Design a protein around this nucleic acid. Sequence first.
DNA 1: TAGG
Length: 79
Amino acid sequence: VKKIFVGGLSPDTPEEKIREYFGGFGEVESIELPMDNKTNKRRGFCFITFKEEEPVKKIMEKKYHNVGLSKCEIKVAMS
DNA sequence: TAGG
């Protein structure tokens, strides 16, 4: 476990909080906020990564994270 | 709710 798939949210959830919510989680690896522009679907959610695997470990526990304003089903993502 |  290292990344995480946060479901639906804000068209462009401020990666800055996502950096905190998860940064505070530990060492975030990298963040990403989808958007119905490549396939035209609902997507538009979030994906966070942790250099490590612990914040992630917990994350799935809190799958439904509350990033500042946006909150979503954070199922250990995958690409 | 699965980017990209």
